[PDB]
Amino acid sequence: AHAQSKREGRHSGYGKRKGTREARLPSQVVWIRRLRVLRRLLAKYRDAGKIDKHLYHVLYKES
Amino acid sequence: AKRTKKVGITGKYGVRYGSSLRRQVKKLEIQQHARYDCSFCGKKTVKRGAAGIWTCSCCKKTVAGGAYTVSTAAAATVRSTIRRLREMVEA
Amino acid sequence: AQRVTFRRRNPYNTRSNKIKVVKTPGGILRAQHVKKLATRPKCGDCGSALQGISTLRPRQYATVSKTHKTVSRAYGGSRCANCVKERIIRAFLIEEQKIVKKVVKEQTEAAK
Amino acid sequence: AAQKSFRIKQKMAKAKKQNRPLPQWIRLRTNNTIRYNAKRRNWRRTKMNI
Amino acid sequence: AREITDIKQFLELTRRADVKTATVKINKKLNKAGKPFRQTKFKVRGSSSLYTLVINDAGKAKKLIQSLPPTLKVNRL
Amino acid sequence: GRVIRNQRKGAGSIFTSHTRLRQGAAKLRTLDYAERHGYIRGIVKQIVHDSGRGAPLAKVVFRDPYKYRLREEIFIANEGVHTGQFIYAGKKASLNVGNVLPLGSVPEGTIVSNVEEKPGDRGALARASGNYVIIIGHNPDENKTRVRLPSGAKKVISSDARGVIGVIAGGGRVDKPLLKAGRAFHKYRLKRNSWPKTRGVAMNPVDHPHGGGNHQHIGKASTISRGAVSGQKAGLIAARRTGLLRG
RNA sequence: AGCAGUUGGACGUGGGUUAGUCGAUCCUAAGAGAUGGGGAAGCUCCGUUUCAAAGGCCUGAUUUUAUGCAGGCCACCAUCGAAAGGGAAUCCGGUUAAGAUUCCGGAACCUGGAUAUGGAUUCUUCACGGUAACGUAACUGAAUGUGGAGACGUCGGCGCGAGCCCUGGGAGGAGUUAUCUUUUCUUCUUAACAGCUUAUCACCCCGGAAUUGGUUUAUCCGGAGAUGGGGUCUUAUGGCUGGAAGAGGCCAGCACCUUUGCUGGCUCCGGUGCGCUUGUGACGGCCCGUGAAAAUCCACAGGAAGGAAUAGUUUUCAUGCCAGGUCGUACUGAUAACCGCAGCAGGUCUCCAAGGUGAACAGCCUCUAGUUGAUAGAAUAAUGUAGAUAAGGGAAGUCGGCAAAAUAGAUCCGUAACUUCGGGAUAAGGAUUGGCUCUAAGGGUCGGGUACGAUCAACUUAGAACUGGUACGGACAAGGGGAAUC
RNA sequence: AACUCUGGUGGAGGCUCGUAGCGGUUCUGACGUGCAAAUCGAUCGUCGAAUUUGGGUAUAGGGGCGAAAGACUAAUCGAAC
Ligand SMILES: [Mg+2]
Ligand SMILES: [Mg+2]
Ligand SMILES: [Mg+2]
Ligand SMILES: [Mg+2]
Ligand SMILES: [Mg+2]
Ligand SMILES: [Mg+2]
Ligand SMILES: [Mg+2]
Ligand SMILES: [Mg+2]
Ligand SMILES: [Mg+2]
Ligand SMILES: [Mg+2]
Ligand SMILES: [Mg+2]
Ligand SMILES: [Mg+2]
Ligand SMILES: [Mg+2]
Ligand SMILES: [Mg+2]
Ligand SMILES: [Mg+2]
Ligand SMILES: [Mg+2]
Ligand SMILES: [Mg+2]
Ligand SMILES: [Mg+2]
Ligand SMILES: [Mg+2]
Ligand SMILES: [Mg+2]
Ligand SMILES: [Mg+2]
Ligand SMILES: [Mg+2]
Ligand SMILES: [Mg+2]
Ligand SMILES: [Mg+2]
Ligand SMILES: [Mg+2]
Ligand SMILES: [Mg+2]
Ligand SMILES: [Mg+2]
Ligand SMILES: [Mg+2]
Ligand SMILES: [Mg+2]
Ligand SMILES: [Mg+2]
Ligand SMILES: [Mg+2]
Ligand SMILES: [Mg+2]
Ligand SMILES: [Mg+2]
Ligand SMILES: [Mg+2]
Ligand SMILES: [Mg+2]
Ligand SMILES: [Mg+2]
Ligand SMILES: [Mg+2]
Ligand SMILES: [Mg+2]
Ligand SMILES: [Mg+2]
Ligand SMILES: [Mg+2]
Ligand SMILES: [Mg+2]
Ligand SMILES: [Mg+2]
Ligand SMILES: [Mg+2]
Ligand SMILES: [Mg+2]
Ligand SMILES: [Mg+2]
Ligand SMILES: [Mg+2]
Ligand SMILES: [Mg+2]
Ligand SMILES: [Mg+2]
Ligand SMILES: [Mg+2]
């Protein structure tokens, strides 16, 4: 029941937190998720042909 | 960004050890961690491998060198002197 | 969670005392003493792990057949097909430069 | 120690076979003076020191 | 334990002059799309390994269980 | 009344070298007919790190002249030698960096290293990292060679003693500060138990000549005679002068 | 057994420890130590390959053979030293009052030896295919040499696997049921070994790259040949099968001093993840630190030697046959089996490790398991010991803020002097924090003409309304700070 | 123009807060014919390395060993038993 409440978003306010933000979920983990998402989308687009390799190589380093 | 103004690699030492000592070690920890160009394959892939050993990651070739640089000035002078004496002896 | 014990009288977490929890057909978790992982045979020239040869602990090579321990080329389970290629190229070229050096030296000693 | 030597187990076997009281018929012998086993050992009282 | 996928290799294996015993084990199994059927494992006890021939058709199982040698002790179940 | 710490180092109980990880005695090749009459080619197969040594070691493989096998020697690598380099050792060797040739068969001003004191003792002088011996003389009528050692000392060696051309690798090692007792700990942990050093003035009078007193001072003169005995020589032994090197 | 005692680690009498596979045994480490030799009045000391005449391995496979009355080869030079290092090989299920990786049943594997059959190779005598990386059931190989494995630091993040955890459907059993709950708990397992498949890395073939491209979380790589298209390999690891359902587990019905059982059913299909523990892979950081040795096993180079009929030899291919000794093995491993004079709040090395809260292996509560042991009863004086609270004052107490109190988590704001420019810094200082109902962002897989949707799932963040005796890090847990001097 | 700045990434340090661990500051708390010939409670220092530790081994008494207190060398140390 408490887990379903947490999935609905309750019990997660400011006074229900004892660890830091980087302790609760690391910024490195968030970055790794983001960078893998952007690289997956870029490789999917380049192999699908909707961007070429010259646009892909700009967007890879800009991402 | 520019994380540190002047300590560079010696920001790991914190406030300790003295500023002159941290400068003196900074000028050699840059030197011993720099990538050097190989005299055999031309790529900048030479790293230090327990001071005096300088190994190229391409072509796997290892050269003896100085403790923090590949070629000390004394060794380059020795190389020039031995080249001069060999050219004088064999000619 | 069921908790397991060492099966041998060594109680320490040494390199030869690694275990792995496995579930048995009786339904219970039991420790299983895993042996050490084998190392690939390396080349005697470049030290890179060489192909076609099985990765066994050293006395397990006495058990397997000759095919698993070598490759059908010269320097089979000793060298790694580019070292052999370099040895062949060097053996050909230096033993031709020796003939070239022999006739050049014979020419220079026969001129004067 | 659960991984003994045979010398230790031999002395332990001798100690086991000696860990007995006096035989009662010895007290009935002619001119008997032995009253009890005076070399009696227990694991809780005196360690046998290998 | 080794599994045989061959019938003739199994049949020459039953006459190897070291094999004394075999087993016929009847499994009540299910195929793909879940219809009940009768799997039959013929297990020859060699002197080093136990060889299992798994037959999923009862007609072939009935054929080989009669083609078994008569001098060989066959256990059932 | 007590045997003091410098006296305790000669019994060699805890003060022995820590020689588990060391590659071997880094010596020259033994003086044979090939090295004495012509040259012999070896091959550098590894430049490895010696433990407790500031300089790398070149594992140079030669061919045994009399038996078909390979003889592996452990040289101290001069600065510039590489793996796969042919090292030519002997009297008829050429003047290249890494070659091992006698001091008679080199020109004046030649810079050698791992150079012998007597012909055949397989390397004695200029073996630490960055060090070298300059060849300042020859005396062919008495088969001698005047050299300048790393300490500035002029020494007269036989002209048949060998040396390896170049400077010993690993130069400039002492120019970096250790910065911490951890780095000094791991330095001396693979050499020997000569660290940390308690000062003798901090000791008790039974432990040291300098110990004792209500103030930490030395008391008598620190300059001790050369003819003083074991136990008194705790200070500046046989000092010619003291104080800073200024005039 | 500092009370007791019918109990006991006690007293009396017995029973109990099963191994080719677990260890020792073997190897070497730091080191100990004979011999030769030297010293010493000597007990003995040095040294460990020395300044020694230090020696044993196969004969080309065989009848003048207990194999020599022959060559040929090896130049090393005791031994001890690890029940945590190196190491040939065993697992599941059952079993005892007490033993089990040791017994029993089934299924293996290793080493040593003998040795037959099938296959293979052979009139091109010692195989063939692939361009190649390499493949195979095999597919001669002495001296000698070379090489590999054994064989190796530590930290960091990332990837994969296992076990656990969480969880959906279904097939059982148990609980709750005034009301509610398609509900709460529980079973749903698969060993060593074997076959076939299975990969990061690495390598090969084609091709020839600037409009530089590929690519990692971490920026390395490419004319010394990238991307790309094909392949080759190691088999950590996973999957399918054999083991193997016949075992184990959960049930049901019948038997009901039944010998003490019988019969039947089910044991199925998934999901998830910055989870935990662990193994591992490719990397990266560090070092004036570069992180054992030997036994042992294998391969290669070499070509000494040996040998061709319907299979001459040889078989590292398969199947067969025999053997595996000695010692240890019970139990405690500690608030009672060890040391501390003892049944002592002390000390003593290590493996496994569930749910919630939470950052957490913290504290607090529970499941499996274990314990409920420590002289007890009554009463509630002073003085204690341990824990608290206290009006007003707030260090006036004291040598001295000793002791206590205050502060404390997280989010946002704000932060001085000085500085070696790294810090100081959680400076100082200040707001917010519950519950409930919502909102909005942050993903994975699924298609195109030779602009967009199904579908699945996790918890992070930010905001809003409402709400309450303005409570909310509601227990626990949890910095007092500042100015200075030596 | 030499070159500056910003946001990320990354994960260094004999860095910090803090478990286990290792110590042992203060109470000069408890006990002080003790649980204990050095313990107990709170409070503390430190907690990834000059770390902590088992086993093996070496050093032996006018000797050892000592990051030094005359410390430690089997409840024995300004010379053990
Ligand atoms: Mg976290
Ligand atoms: Mg970060
Ligand atoms: Mg196993
Ligand atoms: Mg030594
Ligand atoms: Mg000092
Ligand atoms: Mg003092
Ligand atoms: Mg009593
Ligand atoms: Mg009584
Ligand atoms: Mg009894
Ligand atoms: Mg064993
Ligand atoms: Mg031994
Ligand atoms: Mg071991
Ligand atoms: Mg069992
Ligand atoms: Mg038992
Ligand atoms: Mg059995
Ligand atoms: Mg045939
Ligand atoms: Mg063939
Ligand atoms: Mg098994
Ligand atoms: Mg490619
Ligand atoms: Mg662990
Ligand atoms: Mg091998
Ligand atoms: Mg075979
Ligand atoms: Mg036992
Ligand atoms: Mg036992
Ligand atoms: Mg036990
Ligand atoms: Mg006791
Ligand atoms: Mg005692
Ligand atoms: Mg008790
Ligand atoms: Mg938990
Ligand atoms: Mg949580
Ligand atoms: Mg009364
Ligand atoms: Mg008050
Ligand atoms: Mg008040
Ligand atoms: Mg006052
Ligand atoms: Mg007063
Ligand atoms: Mg206080
Ligand atoms: Mg603050
Ligand atoms: Mg301040
Ligand atoms: Mg609110
Ligand atoms: Mg620290
Ligand atoms: Mg700290
Ligand atoms: Mg602590
Ligand atoms: Mg501990
Ligand atoms: Mg007190
Ligand atoms: Mg009292
Ligand atoms: Mg008492
Ligand atoms: Mg003395
Ligand atoms: Mg004093
Ligand atoms: Mg003492």
| Out of B13, B64, B69, closest to residue F80 by CB | B64
Give the residue on B whose Cα is nearest the Cα of F171. B66
**Which nucleotides in chain G have some atom under 7 angstroms from a protein Cβ?**
9-13, 16, 22-23, 29-31, 83-94, 101, 106-111, 127-130, 132-140, 144-152, 157-159, 161-165, 187-195, 201-204, 211-222, 224, 232-237, 241-249, 274, 278-281, 285-292, 295-302, 316-321, 327-333, 338-339, 342-343, 349-354, 356-360, 409-412, 420-423, 432-440, 442-445, 459-463, 472-474
CA atoms of D22 and D18, how far apart (whole Å): 10
Q: How far is the CA of C33 from the centre of ligand 43 (A)?
A: 26
Quickly list H helices, chain F: 33-37, 181-188
Q: Verify whether the Cβ–Cβ distance F94 to B74 is below 8 Å.
A: no
**Tokens, residue F174:** 């002492």
CA–C1' nearest nucleotide, residue C10: G84
| Number of residues in chain B | 91
Q: Tell which F residues from 181 to 220 touch B, by Cβ distance under 8 Å.
A: none
Q: Verify whether the Cβ–Cβ distance F80 to B62 is below 8 Å.
A: no
| B3 contact to strand H (CB, 7 A limit) | yes
CA atoms of B69 and F169, how far apart (whole Å): 10
Cα–Cα–Cα angle for A63, B5, B10, rounded to 5 degrees = 95
In degrees to the nearest 10, what's the CA dihedral of C68, C69, C70, C76? 160
Can you give the distance from the CA of residue F144 to the C1' of nucleotide G170 in angstroms? 100
In Å, how far are A22, F111, F125, F126, F153 from F150, measured between CA atoms?
57, 11, 8, 7, 7
| Out of B22, B62, B75, closest to residue F171 by CB | B75
Q: Which residues of F touch B10 (CB under 8 A)?
A: none
In Å, how far are B46, B53, D30, F29 from F111, measured between CA atoms?
27, 21, 105, 19
What sign has the CA pseudo-torsion F87, F93, F96, F98? positive
Q: Verify whether the Cβ–Cβ distance B82 to F166 is below 8 Å.
A: yes
CA atoms of F128 and D47, how far apart (whole Å): 60
Q: Which amino acid is at A12?
A: S
Residue F75's beta-bridge partner residues?
F58
Inspect the structure and tell me whether chains B and F have 3 or more CB pairs less than 8 Å apart.
yes
Cα–Cα–Cα angle for F98, F99, F100, rounded to 5 degrees = 120
Residue F63 burial class via C-beta count within 10 angstroms: exposed 0-12, middle 13-18, buried 19 and up:
middle
**Tokens, residue E75:** 């256990």
Residues 6 or more apart in contact with residue F92 via CB below 8 angstroms? F37, F38, F39, F105
Complete DSSP assignment for E11-69: HHHTTSSS--EEEEEEEEEE-TT--EEEEEEEEEE-SS-EEEEEE--HHHHHHHHHHS-
Q: What is the resolution of this structure in A?
A: 3.0
What sign has the CA pseudo-torsion F1, F7, F12, F17? positive
Residue F133's beta-bridge partner residues?
F112
**Tokens, residue C68:** 């698993």
The total of other beta-carbon atoms located within 10 Å of residue B40's CB is 14
Q: How far is the CA of C28 from the centre of ligand 25 (A)?
A: 20
- How close does chain F come to B13, measured CA to CA in Å? 9
In degrees to the nearest 10, what's the CA dihedral of C59, C62, C63, C67? 120
Q: Verify whether the Cβ–Cβ distance F111 to B78 is below 8 Å.
A: yes
CA atoms of F107 and B85, how far apart (whole Å): 7
| F82 contact to strand G (CB, 7 A limit) | no
**Which nucleotides in chain H have some atom under 7 angstroms from a protein Cβ?**
4-15, 49-51, 58-59, 62-70, 78-79
Q: Whose structure tokens read 């006495």?
A: C62
Residue F30 carries which DSSP code? P
In degrees to the nearest 10, what's the CA dihedral of E31, E33, E35, E41? 0
Give the rounded distance of the alpha carbon of A38 from its chain centre. Answer: 9
Contact D11, D37 (CB under 8 A): no
Q: How was this structure determined?
A: cryo-EM
| B20 contact to strand H (CB, 7 A limit) | no
Residue D17 carries which DSSP code? H
Complete DSSP assignment for B23-72: HHHHHHHHHHHS-B--TTT--S-EEESSSSEEEESSTT-EEE--SSSSS-
Can you give the distance from the CA of residue E1 to the C1' of nucleotide G245 in angstroms? 15
Q: Is the previous residue joined to E36 through a cis bond, with omega within 30 degrees of 0?
A: no
What sign has the CA pseudo-torsion C93, C94, C95, C99? positive
CA–C1' nearest nucleotide, residue F202: H68
CA atoms of F134 and F113, how far apart (whole Å): 9
- How close does chain B come to F99, measured CA to CA in Å? 11
In Å, how far are A25, A26, A52, F113 from A33, measured between CA atoms?
12, 11, 24, 57
